[PDB]
PDB file of C-alpha atoms in Angstrom:
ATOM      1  CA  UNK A   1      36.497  58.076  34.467  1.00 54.56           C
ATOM      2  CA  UNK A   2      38.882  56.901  37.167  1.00 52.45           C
ATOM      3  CA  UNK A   3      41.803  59.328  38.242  1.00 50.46           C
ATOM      4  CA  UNK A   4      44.662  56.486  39.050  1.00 49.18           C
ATOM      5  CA  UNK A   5      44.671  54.781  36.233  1.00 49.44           C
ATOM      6  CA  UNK A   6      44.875  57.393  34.019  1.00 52.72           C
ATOM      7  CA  UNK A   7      47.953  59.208  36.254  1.00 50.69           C
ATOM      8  CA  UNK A   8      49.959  55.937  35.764  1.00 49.34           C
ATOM      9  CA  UNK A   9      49.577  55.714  32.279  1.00 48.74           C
ATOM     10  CA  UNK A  10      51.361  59.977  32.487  1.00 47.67           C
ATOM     11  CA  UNK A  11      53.930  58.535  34.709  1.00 49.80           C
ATOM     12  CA  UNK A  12      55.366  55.821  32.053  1.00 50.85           C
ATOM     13  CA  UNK A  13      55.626  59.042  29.798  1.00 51.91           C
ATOM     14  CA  UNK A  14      57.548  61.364  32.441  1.00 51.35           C
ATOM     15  CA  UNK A  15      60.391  58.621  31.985  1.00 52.10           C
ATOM     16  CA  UNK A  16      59.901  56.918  28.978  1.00 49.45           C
ATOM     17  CA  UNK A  17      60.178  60.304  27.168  1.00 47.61           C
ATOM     18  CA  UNK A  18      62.691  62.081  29.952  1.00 46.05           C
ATOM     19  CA  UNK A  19      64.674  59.141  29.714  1.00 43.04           C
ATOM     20  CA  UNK A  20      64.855  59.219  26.080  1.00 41.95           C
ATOM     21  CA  UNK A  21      66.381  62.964  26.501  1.00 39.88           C
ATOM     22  CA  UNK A  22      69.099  61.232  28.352  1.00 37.97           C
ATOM     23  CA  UNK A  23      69.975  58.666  25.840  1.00 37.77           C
ATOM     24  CA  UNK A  24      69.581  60.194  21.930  1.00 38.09           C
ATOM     25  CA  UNK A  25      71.396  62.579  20.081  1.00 35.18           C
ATOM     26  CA  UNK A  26      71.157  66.517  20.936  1.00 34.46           C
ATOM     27  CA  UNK A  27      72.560  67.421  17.777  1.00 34.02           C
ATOM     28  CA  UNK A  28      72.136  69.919  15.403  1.00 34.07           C
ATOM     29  CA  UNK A  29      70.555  69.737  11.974  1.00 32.21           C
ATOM     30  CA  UNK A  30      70.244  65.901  10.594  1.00 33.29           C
ATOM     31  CA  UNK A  31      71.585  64.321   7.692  1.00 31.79           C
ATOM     32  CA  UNK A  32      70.098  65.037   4.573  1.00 33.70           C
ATOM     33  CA  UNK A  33      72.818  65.454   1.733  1.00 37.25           C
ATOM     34  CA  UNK A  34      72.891  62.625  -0.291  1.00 34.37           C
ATOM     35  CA  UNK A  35      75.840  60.726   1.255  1.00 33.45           C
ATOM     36  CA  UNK A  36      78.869  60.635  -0.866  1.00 34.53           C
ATOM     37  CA  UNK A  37      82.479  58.977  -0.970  1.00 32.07           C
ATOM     38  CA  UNK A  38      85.606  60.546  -1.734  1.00 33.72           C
ATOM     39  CA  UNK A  39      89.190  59.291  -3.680  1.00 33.55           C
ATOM     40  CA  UNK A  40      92.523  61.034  -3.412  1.00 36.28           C
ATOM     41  CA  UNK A  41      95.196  60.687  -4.550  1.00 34.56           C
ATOM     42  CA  UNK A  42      98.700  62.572  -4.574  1.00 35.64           C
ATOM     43  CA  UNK A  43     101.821  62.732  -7.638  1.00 36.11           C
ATOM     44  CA  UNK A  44     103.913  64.806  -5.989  1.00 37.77           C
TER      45      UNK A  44
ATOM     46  CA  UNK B   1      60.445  30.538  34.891  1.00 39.98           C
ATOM     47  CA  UNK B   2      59.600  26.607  36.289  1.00 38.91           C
ATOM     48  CA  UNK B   3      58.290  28.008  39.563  1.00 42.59           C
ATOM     49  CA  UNK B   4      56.396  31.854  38.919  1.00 42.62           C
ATOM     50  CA  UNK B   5      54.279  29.725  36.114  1.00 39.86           C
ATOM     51  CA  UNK B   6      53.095  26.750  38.081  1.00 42.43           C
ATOM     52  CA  UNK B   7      52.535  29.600  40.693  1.00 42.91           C
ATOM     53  CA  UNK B   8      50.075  31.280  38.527  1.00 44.94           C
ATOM     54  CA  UNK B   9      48.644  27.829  37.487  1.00 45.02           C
ATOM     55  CA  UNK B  10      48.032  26.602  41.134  1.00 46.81           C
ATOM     56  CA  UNK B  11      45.877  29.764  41.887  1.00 46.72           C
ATOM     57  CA  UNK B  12      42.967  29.891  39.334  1.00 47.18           C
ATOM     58  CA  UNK B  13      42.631  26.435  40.067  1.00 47.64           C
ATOM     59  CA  UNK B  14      41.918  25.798  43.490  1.00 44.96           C
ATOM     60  CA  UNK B  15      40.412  29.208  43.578  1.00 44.16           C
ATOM     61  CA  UNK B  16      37.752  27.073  42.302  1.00 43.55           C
ATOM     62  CA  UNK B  17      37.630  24.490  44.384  1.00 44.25           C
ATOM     63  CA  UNK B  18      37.226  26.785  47.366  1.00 46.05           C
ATOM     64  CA  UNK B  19      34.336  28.043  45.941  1.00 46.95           C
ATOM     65  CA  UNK B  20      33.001  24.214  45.531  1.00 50.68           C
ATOM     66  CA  UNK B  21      32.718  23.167  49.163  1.00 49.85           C
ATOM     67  CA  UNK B  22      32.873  27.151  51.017  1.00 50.86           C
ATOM     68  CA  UNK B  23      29.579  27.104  48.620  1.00 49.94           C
ATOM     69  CA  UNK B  24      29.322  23.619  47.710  1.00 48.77           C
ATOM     70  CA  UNK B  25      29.222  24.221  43.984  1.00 49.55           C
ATOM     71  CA  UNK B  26      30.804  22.536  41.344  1.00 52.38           C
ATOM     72  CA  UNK B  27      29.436  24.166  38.036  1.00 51.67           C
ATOM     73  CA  UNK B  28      30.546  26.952  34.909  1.00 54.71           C
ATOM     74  CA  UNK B  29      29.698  29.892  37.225  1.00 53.36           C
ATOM     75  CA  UNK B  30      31.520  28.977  40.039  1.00 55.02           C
ATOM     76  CA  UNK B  31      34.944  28.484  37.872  1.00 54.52           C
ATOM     77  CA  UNK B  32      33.204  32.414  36.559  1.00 53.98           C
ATOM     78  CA  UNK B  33      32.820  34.109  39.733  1.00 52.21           C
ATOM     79  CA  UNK B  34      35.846  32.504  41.456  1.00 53.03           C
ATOM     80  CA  UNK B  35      38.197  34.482  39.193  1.00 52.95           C
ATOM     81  CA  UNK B  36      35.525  37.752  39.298  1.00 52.94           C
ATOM     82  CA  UNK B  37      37.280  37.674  43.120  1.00 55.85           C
ATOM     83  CA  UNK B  38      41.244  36.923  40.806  1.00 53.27           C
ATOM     84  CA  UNK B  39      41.086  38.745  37.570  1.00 53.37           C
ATOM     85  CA  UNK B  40      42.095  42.021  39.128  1.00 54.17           C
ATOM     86  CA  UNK B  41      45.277  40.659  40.898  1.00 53.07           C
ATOM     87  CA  UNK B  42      46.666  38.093  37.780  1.00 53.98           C
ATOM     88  CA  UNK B  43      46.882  41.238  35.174  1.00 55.26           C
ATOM     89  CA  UNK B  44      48.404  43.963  38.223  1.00 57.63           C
ATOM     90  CA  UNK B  45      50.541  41.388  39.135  1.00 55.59           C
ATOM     91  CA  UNK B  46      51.822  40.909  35.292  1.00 56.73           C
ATOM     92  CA  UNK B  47      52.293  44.192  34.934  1.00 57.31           C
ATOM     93  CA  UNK B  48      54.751  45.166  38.181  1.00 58.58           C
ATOM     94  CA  UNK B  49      56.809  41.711  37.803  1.00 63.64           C
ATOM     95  CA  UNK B  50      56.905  43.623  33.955  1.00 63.66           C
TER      96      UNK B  50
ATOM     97  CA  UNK C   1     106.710  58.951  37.962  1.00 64.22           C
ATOM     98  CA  UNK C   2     108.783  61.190  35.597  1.00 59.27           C
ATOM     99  CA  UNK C   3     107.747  63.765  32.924  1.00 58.72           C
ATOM    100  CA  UNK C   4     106.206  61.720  29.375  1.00 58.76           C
ATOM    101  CA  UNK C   5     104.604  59.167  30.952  1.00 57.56           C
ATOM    102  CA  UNK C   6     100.972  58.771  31.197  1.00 59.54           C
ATOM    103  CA  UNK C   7      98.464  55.925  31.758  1.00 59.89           C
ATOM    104  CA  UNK C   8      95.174  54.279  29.799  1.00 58.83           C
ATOM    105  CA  UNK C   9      92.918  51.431  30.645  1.00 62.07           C
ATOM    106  CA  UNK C  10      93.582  49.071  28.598  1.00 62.89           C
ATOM    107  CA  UNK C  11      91.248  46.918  27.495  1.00 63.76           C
ATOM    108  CA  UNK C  12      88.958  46.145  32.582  1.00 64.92           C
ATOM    109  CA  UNK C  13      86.107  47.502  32.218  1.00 64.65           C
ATOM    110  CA  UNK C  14      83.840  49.889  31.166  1.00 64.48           C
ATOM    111  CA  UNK C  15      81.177  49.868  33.190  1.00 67.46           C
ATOM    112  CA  UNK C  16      80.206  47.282  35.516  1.00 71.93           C
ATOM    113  CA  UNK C  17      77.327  45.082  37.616  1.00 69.10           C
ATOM    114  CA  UNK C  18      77.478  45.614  40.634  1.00 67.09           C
ATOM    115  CA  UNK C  19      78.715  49.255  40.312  1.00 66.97           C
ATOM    116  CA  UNK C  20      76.449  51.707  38.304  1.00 62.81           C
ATOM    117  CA  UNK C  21      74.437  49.468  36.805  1.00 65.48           C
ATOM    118  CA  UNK C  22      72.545  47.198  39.167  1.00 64.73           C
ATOM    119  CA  UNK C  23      71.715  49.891  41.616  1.00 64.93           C
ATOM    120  CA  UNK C  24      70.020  52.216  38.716  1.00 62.00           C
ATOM    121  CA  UNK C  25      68.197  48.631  37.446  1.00 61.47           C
ATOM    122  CA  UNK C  26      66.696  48.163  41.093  1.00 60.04           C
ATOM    123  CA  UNK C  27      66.183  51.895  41.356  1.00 60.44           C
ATOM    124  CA  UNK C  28      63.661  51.673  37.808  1.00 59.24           C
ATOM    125  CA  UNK C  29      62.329  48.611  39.000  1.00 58.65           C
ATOM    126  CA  UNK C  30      60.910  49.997  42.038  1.00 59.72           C
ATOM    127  CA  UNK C  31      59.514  53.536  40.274  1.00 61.70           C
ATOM    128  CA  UNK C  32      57.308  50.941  37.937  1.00 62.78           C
ATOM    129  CA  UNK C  33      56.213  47.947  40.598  1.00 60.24           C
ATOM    130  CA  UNK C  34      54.705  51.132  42.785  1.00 55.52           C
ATOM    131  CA  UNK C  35      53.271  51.683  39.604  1.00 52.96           C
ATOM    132  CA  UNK C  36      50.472  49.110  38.133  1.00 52.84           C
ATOM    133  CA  UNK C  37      49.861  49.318  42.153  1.00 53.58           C
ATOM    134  CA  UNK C  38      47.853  52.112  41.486  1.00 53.82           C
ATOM    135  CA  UNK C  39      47.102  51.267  37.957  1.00 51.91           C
ATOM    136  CA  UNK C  40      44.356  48.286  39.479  1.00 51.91           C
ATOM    137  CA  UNK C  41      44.289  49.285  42.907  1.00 48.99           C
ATOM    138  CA  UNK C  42      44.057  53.809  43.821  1.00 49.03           C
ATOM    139  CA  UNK C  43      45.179  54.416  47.249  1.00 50.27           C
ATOM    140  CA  UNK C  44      48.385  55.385  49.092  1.00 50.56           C
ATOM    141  CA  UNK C  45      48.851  52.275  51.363  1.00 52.33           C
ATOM    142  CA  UNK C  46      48.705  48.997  48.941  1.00 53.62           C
ATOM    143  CA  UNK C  47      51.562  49.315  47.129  1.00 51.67           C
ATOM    144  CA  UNK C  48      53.696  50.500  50.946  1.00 53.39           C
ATOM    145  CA  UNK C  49      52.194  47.019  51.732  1.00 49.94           C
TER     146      UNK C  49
ATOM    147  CA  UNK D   1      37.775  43.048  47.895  1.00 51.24           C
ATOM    148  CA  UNK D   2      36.013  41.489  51.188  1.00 56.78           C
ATOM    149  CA  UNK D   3      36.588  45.397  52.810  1.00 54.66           C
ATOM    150  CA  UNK D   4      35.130  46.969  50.065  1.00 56.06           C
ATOM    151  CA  UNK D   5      32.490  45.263  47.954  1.00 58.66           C
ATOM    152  CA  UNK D   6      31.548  43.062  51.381  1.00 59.07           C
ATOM    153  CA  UNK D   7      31.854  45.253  54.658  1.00 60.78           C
ATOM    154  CA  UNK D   8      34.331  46.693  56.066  1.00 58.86           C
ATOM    155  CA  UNK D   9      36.325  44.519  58.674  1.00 59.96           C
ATOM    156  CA  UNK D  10      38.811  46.936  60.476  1.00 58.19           C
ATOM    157  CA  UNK D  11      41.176  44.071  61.262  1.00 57.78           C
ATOM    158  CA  UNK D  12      38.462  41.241  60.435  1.00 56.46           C
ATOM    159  CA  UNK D  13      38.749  41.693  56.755  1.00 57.99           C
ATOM    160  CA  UNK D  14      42.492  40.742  56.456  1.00 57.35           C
ATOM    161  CA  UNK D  15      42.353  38.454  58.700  1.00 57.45           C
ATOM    162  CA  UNK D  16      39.159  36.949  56.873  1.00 59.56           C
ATOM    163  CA  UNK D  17      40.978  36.767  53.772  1.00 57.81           C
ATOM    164  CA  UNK D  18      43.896  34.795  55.505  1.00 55.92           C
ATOM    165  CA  UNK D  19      41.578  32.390  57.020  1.00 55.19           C
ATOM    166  CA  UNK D  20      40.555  31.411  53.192  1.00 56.30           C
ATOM    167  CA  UNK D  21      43.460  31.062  50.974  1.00 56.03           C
ATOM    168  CA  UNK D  22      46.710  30.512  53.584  1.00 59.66           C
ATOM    169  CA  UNK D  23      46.480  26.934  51.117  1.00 61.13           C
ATOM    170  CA  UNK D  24      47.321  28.671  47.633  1.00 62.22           C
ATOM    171  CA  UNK D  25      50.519  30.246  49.367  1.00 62.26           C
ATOM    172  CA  UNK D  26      51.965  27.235  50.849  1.00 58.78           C
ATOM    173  CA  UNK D  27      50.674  25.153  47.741  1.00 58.45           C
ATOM    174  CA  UNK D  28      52.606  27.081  45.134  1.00 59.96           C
ATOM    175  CA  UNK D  29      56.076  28.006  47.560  1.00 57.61           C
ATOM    176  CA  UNK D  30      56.349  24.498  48.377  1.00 58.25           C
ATOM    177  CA  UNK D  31      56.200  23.146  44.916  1.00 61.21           C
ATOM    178  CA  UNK D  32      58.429  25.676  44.487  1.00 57.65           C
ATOM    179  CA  UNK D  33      61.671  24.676  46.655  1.00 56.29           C
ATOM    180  CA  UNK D  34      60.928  21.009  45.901  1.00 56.29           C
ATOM    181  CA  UNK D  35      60.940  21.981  42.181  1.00 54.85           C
ATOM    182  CA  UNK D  36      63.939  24.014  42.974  1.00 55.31           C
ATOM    183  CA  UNK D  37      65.687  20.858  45.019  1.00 56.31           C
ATOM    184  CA  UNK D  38      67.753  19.589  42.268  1.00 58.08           C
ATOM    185  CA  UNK D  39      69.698  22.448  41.223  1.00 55.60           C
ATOM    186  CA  UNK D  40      70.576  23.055  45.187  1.00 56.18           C
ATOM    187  CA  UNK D  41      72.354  20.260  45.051  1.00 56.10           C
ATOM    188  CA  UNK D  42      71.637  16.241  43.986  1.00 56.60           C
ATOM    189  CA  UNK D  43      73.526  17.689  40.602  1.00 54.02           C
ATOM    190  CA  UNK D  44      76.931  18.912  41.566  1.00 50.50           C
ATOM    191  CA  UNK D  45      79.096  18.906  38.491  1.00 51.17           C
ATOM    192  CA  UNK D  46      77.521  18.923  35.015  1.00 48.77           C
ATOM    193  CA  UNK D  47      76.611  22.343  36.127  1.00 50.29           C
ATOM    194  CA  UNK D  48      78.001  23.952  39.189  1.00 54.64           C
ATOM    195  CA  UNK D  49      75.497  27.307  38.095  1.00 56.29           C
ATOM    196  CA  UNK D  50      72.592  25.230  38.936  1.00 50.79           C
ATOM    197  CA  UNK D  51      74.083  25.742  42.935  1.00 52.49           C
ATOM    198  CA  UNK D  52      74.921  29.124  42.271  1.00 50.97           C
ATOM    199  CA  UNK D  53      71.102  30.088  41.386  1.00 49.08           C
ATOM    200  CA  UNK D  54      68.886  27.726  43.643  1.00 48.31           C
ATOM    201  CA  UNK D  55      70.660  28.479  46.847  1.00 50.08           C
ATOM    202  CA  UNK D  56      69.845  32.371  46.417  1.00 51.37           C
ATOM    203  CA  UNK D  57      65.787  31.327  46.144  1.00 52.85           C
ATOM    204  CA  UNK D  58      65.283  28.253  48.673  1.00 54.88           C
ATOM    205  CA  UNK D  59      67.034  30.784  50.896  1.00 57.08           C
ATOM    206  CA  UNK D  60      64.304  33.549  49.305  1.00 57.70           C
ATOM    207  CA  UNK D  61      61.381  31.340  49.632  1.00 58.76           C
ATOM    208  CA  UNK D  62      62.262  29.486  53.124  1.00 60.13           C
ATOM    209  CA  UNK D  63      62.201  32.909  54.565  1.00 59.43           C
ATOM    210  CA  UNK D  64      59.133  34.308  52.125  1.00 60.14           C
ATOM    211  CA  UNK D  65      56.314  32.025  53.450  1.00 57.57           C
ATOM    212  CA  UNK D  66      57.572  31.156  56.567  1.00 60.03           C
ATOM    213  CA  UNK D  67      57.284  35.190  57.328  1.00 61.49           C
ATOM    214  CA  UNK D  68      54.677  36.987  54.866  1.00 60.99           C
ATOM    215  CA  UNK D  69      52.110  34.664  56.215  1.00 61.07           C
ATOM    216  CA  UNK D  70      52.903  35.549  59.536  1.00 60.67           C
ATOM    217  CA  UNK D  71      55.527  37.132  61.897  1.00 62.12           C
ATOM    218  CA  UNK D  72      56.261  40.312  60.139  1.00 61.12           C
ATOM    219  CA  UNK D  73      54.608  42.507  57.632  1.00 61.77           C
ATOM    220  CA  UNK D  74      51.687  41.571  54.878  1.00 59.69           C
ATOM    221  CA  UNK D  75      48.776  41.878  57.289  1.00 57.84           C
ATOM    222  CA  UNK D  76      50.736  44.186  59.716  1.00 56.09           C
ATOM    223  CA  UNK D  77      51.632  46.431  56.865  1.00 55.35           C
ATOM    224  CA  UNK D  78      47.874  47.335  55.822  1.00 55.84           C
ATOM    225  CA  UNK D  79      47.045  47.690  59.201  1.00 54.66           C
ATOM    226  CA  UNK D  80      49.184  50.798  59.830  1.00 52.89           C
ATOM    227  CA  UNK D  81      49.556  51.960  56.056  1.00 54.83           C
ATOM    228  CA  UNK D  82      45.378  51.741  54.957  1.00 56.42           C
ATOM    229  CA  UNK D  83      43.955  52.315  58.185  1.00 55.97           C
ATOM    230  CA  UNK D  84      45.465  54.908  61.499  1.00 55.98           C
ATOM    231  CA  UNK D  85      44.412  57.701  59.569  1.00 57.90           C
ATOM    232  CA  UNK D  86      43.328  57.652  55.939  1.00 59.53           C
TER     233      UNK D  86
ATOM    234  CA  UNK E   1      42.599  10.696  55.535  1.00 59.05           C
ATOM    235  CA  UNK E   2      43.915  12.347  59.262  1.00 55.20           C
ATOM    236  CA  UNK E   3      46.330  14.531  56.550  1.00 53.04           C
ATOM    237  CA  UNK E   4      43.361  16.509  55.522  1.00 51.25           C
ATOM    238  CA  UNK E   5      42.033  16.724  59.478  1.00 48.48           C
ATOM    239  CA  UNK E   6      45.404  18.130  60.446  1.00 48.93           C
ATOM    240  CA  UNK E   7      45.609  20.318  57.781  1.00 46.10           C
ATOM    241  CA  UNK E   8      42.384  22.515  58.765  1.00 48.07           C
ATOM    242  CA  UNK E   9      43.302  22.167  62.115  1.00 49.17           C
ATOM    243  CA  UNK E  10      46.613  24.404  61.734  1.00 47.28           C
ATOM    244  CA  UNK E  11      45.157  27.003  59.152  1.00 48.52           C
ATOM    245  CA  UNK E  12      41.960  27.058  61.604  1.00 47.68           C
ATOM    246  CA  UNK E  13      43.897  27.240  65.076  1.00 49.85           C
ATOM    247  CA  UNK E  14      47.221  27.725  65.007  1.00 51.32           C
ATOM    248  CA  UNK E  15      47.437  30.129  62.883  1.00 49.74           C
ATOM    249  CA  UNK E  16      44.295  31.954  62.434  1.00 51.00           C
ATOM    250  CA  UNK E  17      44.357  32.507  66.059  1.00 48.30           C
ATOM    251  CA  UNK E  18      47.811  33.458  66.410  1.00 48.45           C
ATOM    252  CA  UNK E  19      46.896  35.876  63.785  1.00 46.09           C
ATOM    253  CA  UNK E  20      44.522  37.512  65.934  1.00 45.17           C
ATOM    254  CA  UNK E  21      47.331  37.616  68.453  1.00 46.33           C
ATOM    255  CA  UNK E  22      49.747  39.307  65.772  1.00 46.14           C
ATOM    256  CA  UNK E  23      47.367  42.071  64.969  1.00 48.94           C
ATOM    257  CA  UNK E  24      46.701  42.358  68.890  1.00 47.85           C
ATOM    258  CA  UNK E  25      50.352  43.559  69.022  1.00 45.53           C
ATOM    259  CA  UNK E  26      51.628  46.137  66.499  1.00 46.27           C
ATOM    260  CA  UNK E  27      54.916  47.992  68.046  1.00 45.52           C
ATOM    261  CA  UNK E  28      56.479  44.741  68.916  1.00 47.38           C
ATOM    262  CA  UNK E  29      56.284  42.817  65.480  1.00 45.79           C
ATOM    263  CA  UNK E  30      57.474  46.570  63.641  1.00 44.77           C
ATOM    264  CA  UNK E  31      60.622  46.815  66.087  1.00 45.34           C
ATOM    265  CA  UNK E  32      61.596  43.204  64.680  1.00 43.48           C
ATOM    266  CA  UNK E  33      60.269  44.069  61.026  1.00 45.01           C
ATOM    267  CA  UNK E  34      63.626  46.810  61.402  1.00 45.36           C
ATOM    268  CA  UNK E  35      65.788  44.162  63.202  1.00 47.29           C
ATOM    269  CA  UNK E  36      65.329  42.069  60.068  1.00 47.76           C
ATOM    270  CA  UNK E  37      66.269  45.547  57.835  1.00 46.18           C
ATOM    271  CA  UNK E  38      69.545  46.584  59.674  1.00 44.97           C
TER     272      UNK E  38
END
């Protein structure tokens, strides 16, 4: 089609997605164990 | 808001009536072909005041 | 001043508007409006204009 | 559109466009300002932040007409930036 | 109405003419353009 339009529409993406690098979580694996909670007490 | 609204009213509309005296021409396909020459500005312009 | 004695910002800013932010907001805003000047228009004088 | 589409007109194509739609321009800005008039002042203490935002626009629209139709750039810009070379 | 006379008077003369004489001159009009900037 046209070559323009088409390049803009890339150029949204180059930030959009770049800037999205800059702004969530590089960690490592995600959470996935069933979240629990934990009491404790102590009688010493 | 008041003024770039009025601003985009204003246009369209005596787009029109340019086109009904620069071509003496009041009808449908004058109000059709005025904004032919406008429809390509009014959605760019949208989209960099975005 | 003497040994122990440290400092923290309590409590002023943490970042502000016309420090790092607006400069960065103008900065985006001109990377797009070049943009969608291009998008309707293919050249490399209109959006200069 | 009138360069393309129509013919060409070097430095008659901008200034053909002028010519036919200076009206639109001065139409809008000006019922602009005069819509922004009563922030300026006329009110001037049930909000003192109407002052604080029409004074930065009738300032920004004074010197936005009175210049882009004329003077300096936005006729003398695509003269050198379109045309001189490609 | 005269209004409507003097109106296409100024966007015919004026202007239009002294638009001519804008685009006549180039180096002067940038030289201010920068003027403004600084």
């Amino acid at each position: 089609d046209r070559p323009i339009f088409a390049w803009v529409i890339a150029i949204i993406i180059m930030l959009a997605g770049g800037l999205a690098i800059l702004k969530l979580p590089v960690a490592q694996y995600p959470t996935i164990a069933p979240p629990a909670v934990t009491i404790s007490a102590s009688y010493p | 808001a008041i003024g770039l609204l009025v601003d985009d009213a204003i246009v369209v509309v005596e787009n029109v009536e340019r086109v009904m005296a620069e071509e003496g021409l009041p009808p449908k396909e004058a109000t059709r072909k005025s904004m032919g020459q406008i429809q390509g500005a009014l959605v760019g312009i949208a989209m960099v005041l975005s | 001043l003497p040994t122990g004695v440290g400092y923290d910002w309590t409590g002023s800013y943490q970042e502000r508007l016309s420090g790092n932010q607006a400069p960065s907001l103008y900065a985006i805003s001109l990377i797009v409006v070049f943009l969608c000047l291009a998008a309707l228009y293919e050249s490399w004088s209109i959006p200069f204009s | 559109d009138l360069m393309d589409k129509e013919g060409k007109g070097l430095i008659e194509a901008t200034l053909d466009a002028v010519r036919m739609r200076l009206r639109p321009i001065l139409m809008t800005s000006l019922a602009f300002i005069l819509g922004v008039m009563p922030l300026v002042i006329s009110t001037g203490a049930g909000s003192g932040a109407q002052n604080a935002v029409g004074t930065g626009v009738m300032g920004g629209m004074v010197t936005a007409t009175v210049l882009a139709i004329f003077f300096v750039p936005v006729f003398f810009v695509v003269v050198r930036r379109r045309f001189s070379r490609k | 109405f005269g209004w409507f006379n003097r109106m296409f008077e100024k966007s015919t003369h004026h202007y239009t003419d002294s638009v001519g004489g804008i685009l006549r001159s180039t180096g002067r009009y940038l030289v201010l353009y920068l003027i403004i900037v600084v």
